[PDB]
Design a protein around this ligand. Structure first.
Ligand SMILES: Nc1ncnc2c1ncn2[C@@H]1O[C@@H]2COP(=O)(O)O[C@H]2[C@H]1O
Length: 254
């Protein structure tokens, strides 16, 4: 229903930052305070407003993403094909036809396509066919210019699974992950709008979102962890050193 648009025709570091803040502010419950920190926390699951729409507006067309508000999971995307026909692709265990119709009304039922693979990184990475290094998403890099190039592979083109997969990997990281982790957002704006190399720390943050959220939720007092934590990139005692942008909903503080 609610849609936020990122203007990639005229990219601005401030516009990108405000875009991420709109996402954070949309899903957060301001009454929730985890571990005495000021970091925003995703509110309890809504039965009425379940999805959020993100538009990537370019000079030659617009590609859209559909995200689940309860956990920021990307569940679908909208892109015009080679015949300029709007088509929606979705992950099966994530959304229904009726919900997809409401999310992307410009797409007719017949043009809704269920994706052959899973929504998890491993499954998408397999189809991305990355041939160098560890063959994971880290090998693609990050950045505004990279996102623009990836959109070019799906905007008004015949669907190719390899290009679709690579687009999804970058789109998920530049939106959902950047919203959750300010470290990722800061790398994007520091190198704006260039493509740059990703890091092990970027991946380490991503795989430990739940762990970090649980640690702040139940083992942190006034921003200080009760014990030392190491999520892969070193020992952390102060929650602020994590530069968190959005915490996972784990209930209300006890
Ligand atoms: N489709 C997706 N959309 C958004 N975020 C994802 C998606 N698939 C995986 N992730 C993230 O990858 C993370 C891996 O570890 P977590 O269980 O802590 O939390 C997971 C999610 O936050």
């Amino acid at each position: 229903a609610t849609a936020y648009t990122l203007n990639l025709a005229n990219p601005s570091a401030s516009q990108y930052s405000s875009f991420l803040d709109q996402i954070r502010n949309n899903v957060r419950d301001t009454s929730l305070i985890y571990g005495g920190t000021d970091v925003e926390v995703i509110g309890a699951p809504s039965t009425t407003d379940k999805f959020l729409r993100l538009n990537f507006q370019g000079p030659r067309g617009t590609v859209s993403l559909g995200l689940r508000r309860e956990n920021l999971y990307v569940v679908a995307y909208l892109a015009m094909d080679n015949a300029n026909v709007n088509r929606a692709y979705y992950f099966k265990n994530q959304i229904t036809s009726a919900e997809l119709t409401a999310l992307f009304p410009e797409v007719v039922v017949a043009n809704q396509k269920q994706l052959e693979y899973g929504e998890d990184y491993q499954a998408i990475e397999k189809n991305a066919k990355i041939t160098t290094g560890d063959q994971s998403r880290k090998e693609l890099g990050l950045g505004i210019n990279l996102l623009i190039t990836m959109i070019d592979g799906v905007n008004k083109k015949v669907r190719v699974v390899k290009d679709e997969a690579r687009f999804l990997l970058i789109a998920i990281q530049m939106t959902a992950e950047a919203a959750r982790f300010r470290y990722i957002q800061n790398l994007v704006t520091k190198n704006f709008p260039n493509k740059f190399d990703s890091e092990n720390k970027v991946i380490q943050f991503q795989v430990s979102w739940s762990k970090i959220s649980t640690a702040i939720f139940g083992d942190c007092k006034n921003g200080v962890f009760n014990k030392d934590y190491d999520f892969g990139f070193g020992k952390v005692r102060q929650a602020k050193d994590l530069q968190m942008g959005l915490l996972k909903y784990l209930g209300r503080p006890k």
